[PDB]
């Protein structure tokens, strides 16, 4: 990482309001993501915030972290689409300001339905089976009143990987614009 | 292992219709003990046979060889335990032959919940998490026609653990005499 | 394994032609069964054979060499299910002679979809993603003429996992009857 | 491991009626022993059999099946205390019959209190808890009954590890002679 | 992490009394929470400090000298979970002040009772086990409290694992109001 | 790596606009040189940058996000060989603008297909050998318009490995001109 | 591996001229070959011998032995394949006498160009690159002498991967009949 | 080991009445050698036994059993020594009947003190060091009535490794002969 | 190994006078060669011996042990070859009776330099790089005479890797035979 | 590596002309040396550079940025033979600008033939092996015109080995002047 | 490494011209001491530099650079021994300056031969053995031009580890003055 005159490149581009997302959503990106959109919320809250993402998915908790601390700031986040943004990047690229979502003219975007595990007695994995089900249904519910289609339409395109490209996912409601 | 004239220990006692198990139970010691049932019943269809228990558990499919084969052949087993019958001992010493089931004055008895485990893909925890429910299901409703209680005690008692001895498994029902 | 008087165990079953097979099927077992139904089959070409059958999968190449050496022969084969008969022990199975496919009362019966992988080119995936789709539909003709179903039905009914009973397993068209 | 004319060195020995028990205990030992306990016993049961102990301890759960099978049968077991019998040795030392329980000259004997372990949530450190120290309260009631000490001298000296010889345990009273 | 002018984002918040805690609590987190405690009470000690969860959390021995701390300075904490408060994160919760306890619209609750193991002699395991039950009727005495349940109620259903979302645990007690 | 004074040498020449790439692109080397063209595109909007090319390979997604950064921003981007540019470095190499991309007089340039591989069930390897094919045949219509040959000379060239530089590369059209 | 009285289940078929083969070719699986086809001879050399054939592969030098082998003796060899022949059972399926050459209507057959390796200066990568050359232009001069085709269709359809059936491989020349 | 006619190469030296000890002392080699001195000793008791001895010492409770088994038994034992005898074959060799013990001219023979190890708290390691200062003085007073030299001479050349000759322990007692 | 009636089938040939060599040469391969040799040269020193060759490469010292005991023994061995002799192998091709050495019409012949390797000071390089040059100014002194080139054509050509035929190989003299 | 006052010693040598290199040449390296050369020549393109050289090197495409680079630049390079310049550090030797090319009078300078290697089907070493013998060829036409000899001499001296001694590498041409 | 004002304390005895060695010399380490010693010559030619050797020695080649280098610069070197210098450090211990070569009293110096290796063909040995033994008839000359001793004598002193003091170096020439 190079030295701009003393910062490095990634804090020189987040004095112009930058964030850049380019590796798996575990807990500690996503601990680091926040405190970012918490530090540029509190010091100009009326100004606007981008978001780059090249995200091959993540952890579940840890990606409904960064969603609603999107939700809840004062600022307007668009996000931008680079590369490829599969299965927590296709949430988060689909989630931030309806009007603002970009995409480059040959990138992708790939949804499906969340893994899990279980082990144990046979009452441990009724408790853990019945969890990734309400957990299946609420994500279903966000993505329908995000894109905009209905709900049983949803439930079976997102039931094996489903991928998807820049002009093929404006059609079904991800992003708004390509830009050129 | 001594020889005995040839033989050796264990095919001598074979002679006088003695089965002896002493592991714990995967799938070829189901496979030997299904064959020496198969011959001892096909030799002589009318005598007794004996089977010696000492064993820490097993497997749930392996176990339902044995316990199967054992009611379909024509002879009648006695099952007898020596150490410690556990878990998947436990429920074949409690399924031969009503009227000879003995245990040793000192010996003990456990009894608890099934096994197993899942992974991956939220639609396929569903499918194998549906089937160790009702696996549990039919073992706690077959030791209840063999031991004689209803079955909300047995759906209460085999739960975390239930160590017992050779006095307290005479009042449940496992055994029907102490040898002296 | 006893020794039988010289013998041992199960080669004093194979003196009243009875073949048992409890394990995987890799292409040393595949061998040993191929050269047992021979010697059975030349040396008295019109007495019935039993193969009884626990075992819970194995490879699809060297299970169908089981399959087609069996209809070769001229004696008839009786297949018998103790345990459980899980994917390629339910193609076999469902191959004996109609009239003579039994099952004991609490056994298991599982079929699905098959398995496999590819790794190379971009030429050698498409040479090796043909293979496997013409092995699935070469296979979903012959379990419909052996049990009876129409081919749309077997198509979707298998896709993920099917565990089945011996009472679930006649209905469909697997077993022609219940042992006791 | 010789042989001598077809038998072994320790198949040999099994003609004149002499057990030879020689490394730790665990449950594939004690099957053998059984076996040949059982075997001698239906073969002119009132001659006596020999039984020579060299074992550094082993498992507590089968250690009772030998301890239980050699009062069982009709005949009389007299044991011999060869180098040093150590912790479960000295538990089947001390059950031979009384009257003949023999030591050569320069030999050891050690007792102390069981050992185990427990690991889960606070609910199953309560059940292997309680089971060990229900456990230990009846090894000292067999003790106290076989040498003939009060019960607080054997709960209080077999607290950390008690190494004898052979004439300080024929004082306690393990044993019955010393052989020359 | 970015370097904000000279320092990184973690200590650029620090100065406006703000608190991250992101990931397990071994101790060393809880050598470095207590340590900015401590510095942020005796520089202004009245002004409110807050302190934001995100948690798998465990270790009870340092996680109580997190809520030691927390009660014995002077200003007043205030606790917000943002995306998971797991075992020792969601006793945490429920420790800041009475009115001042928040959670986003999705944040996922967990409450259950102590781990731990032990290994020795059987008078070493009793010492081990007789702790962990001392340990365990101590926490859930401090839950009750904070929360304002009956104490009979929740040693029933903190026995296996107990999932909340955003909803239900603010009619336990745990939450005041949820954050839009 | 030096300290050119406070810098190092690839923050020095930095600011002479140069980029360099030495190693594997792997998905961070991609979200580094995003961050440059970023920086220096918005620093000064007319002025060329330049950008040095040795690298052997990488993957595909994180290859066309340089791509397509490169055509986004307004200055314009001139390509240099300098010791090896293999199956992702002459992609990357015929993508300056279209009479600034050089080559030095001992260098090589090697283009062949995509690599990939799956793994699972008889649907997701149908799934996954469908988006390669996919892939591979929109990298072969940008060559065949960045180069200017037909596009099934591209079809057959790229089929096993095609090494050839700086006299054939110049007459094929990946470059423009020999630097001396 | 069972017994038939003192014999065994593969030295039995022997004495009726049947040699199996279900294992990949290595230096020592040739070898047992070579020793049962000399055997054989030289004990009544006007009899026909059979060969069942089911094995993935082996080596080239190993497989020659058998190919020389087979034809230098004085006997006629008929080869049965029976589960799958792949690049060297599809050598040695075409090489028993014509009017034999057998098939299971089940079966599959595989041929390609052989694989190798070097290792070393650059003229030690010269020697063996031009006799892994040779080799090739020597197979498929045997095959096209066997089958009955052409030089430039045989050298042409292996090149990555064949894949053929029961009713494909006879219109192309490699078998004679397909079996009941 | 070859055979001899059927017997062994070590059988027919057991015929004559030979034992031989070539291996290091754990106790399944002292297992093997009292069940040969008890079995030559119960089928004609006045005829004498040979042993020679090439071992490097072993372990000190199974070096035990063989001394004692050697005095207990009623023939006479003549020890040979070939080669070492050292830190426990020396106490053996020196076990012999007074008149008949043995060395060839090149038979190197080691004395000094036990080993051993001790591990835990500080009232574990005084039970474990008391245990082997008892069992020191033990070893040294029987050496001192074997060989016939006082005990303080014993007490201070058996302190480091002492590594004495065929004629130098010939003076010191112990060898009472040197053959030819 | 199938038995043939008892022997195998490597000591039924061995009854008509067939040693078989099929890997490579170690020091236990040469023993039992060498004494199988012995043994066939005793009992009638009149009958010739065959030896087929299968055998790539081996030892320097451990080879020449079976050519000294070729040419010490009385009757007369000729060589044939299948497959291999890759480097040791064909100096033991090339030292059977001068008019009895055959070769099959697809086998191969290698002949190179020895190898090694020397490790020490700079004085136990020397003495070690001295014999391996006194080795192969040795080796090619009995193939010249063996085949009957001159000496500096053998210097020349065995120098980096030499692989011929069984047609190239009877020009240069190594055989004198192909076998039909 | 001392501070020099803020610097390291490697960057107070480089505010002189000076160039250290003292590892073996990987990507890396090529990389960092590459940059020094663009940095000091667009600096003040008319004075001098020196480049003192101490390297085994070897990554031939990766050894060829160097040599490009070095002609390409302005102003002029003069290497310098510190204590070994093995094969592609040699090479770099006699690169330098002829008449200042100096060596210490110990320097033992080595040249000889690349390496590499191949693996895969028989059409893929073919590529392999006829690309190393292509670079092979343009080497030793560089040698043949920066020393002087003609090539047909450079052909066989560059076959195994051969170190030179700093006096014989003057003669040759490959140094020019020796220190002093 | 503490800090003295800054710096540390290793590069606060280079402003007073000491250069410190305390390690193997391996590559990395002659890199930087050539350095050190360029830097300090080129800045004030005319005073001494001193030296501090306390070294177990490392490689040949990477220990003459030092050598050449201390005699290329025009200020004086002044070496001290101060621990242990051994083989490759009394190289340099013995290259200072004639009549400032000194050492403390409790010193010891070492010399021997050189060590190496060689492992390839018959002829690749020879090659490297013909290397090492003529870089040891060049450090004996240096060495005896250097101390003042014959050649015959440095050549048998130095035949195997030759440990010395620093009042028995003193008189073989090694050093100047025992410092004190």
Do not use: W
């Not at 840890?62 to 689409?81: E, L, N, R």
Request: net charge negative; charged share 25%; proline share 4%.
């Amino acid at each position: 990482i190079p030295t701009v005159i003393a910062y490095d490149i990634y804090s020189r581009l987040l004095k112009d309001r930058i964030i850049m997302l380019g590796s798996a959503i575990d807990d500690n990106v996503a601990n680091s993501i926040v405190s970012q959109l918490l530090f540029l919320a509190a010091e100009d809250p009326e100004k606007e915030i981008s978001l780059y993402i090249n995200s091959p998915g993540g952890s579940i908790t840890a990606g409904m972290a960064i969603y609603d601390t999107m939700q809840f700031i004062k600022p307007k986040v668009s996000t931008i689409c680079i590369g490829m943004a599969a299965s927590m990047g296709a949430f988060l690229l689909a989630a931030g300001e309806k009007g603002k979502r970009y995409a480059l003219p040959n990138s992708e975007v790939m949804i499906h339905q969340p893994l899990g595990g279980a082990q144990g007695q046979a009452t441990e994995i009724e408790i853990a089976a019945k969890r990734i089900l309400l957990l299946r249904d609420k994500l279903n519910k966000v993505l329908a009143e995000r894109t905009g289609q209905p709900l049983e339409v949803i439930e079976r395109d997102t039931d094996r990987d489903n991928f998807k490209s820049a002009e093929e996912a404006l059609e079904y409601g991800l992003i708004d614009k390509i830009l050129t």
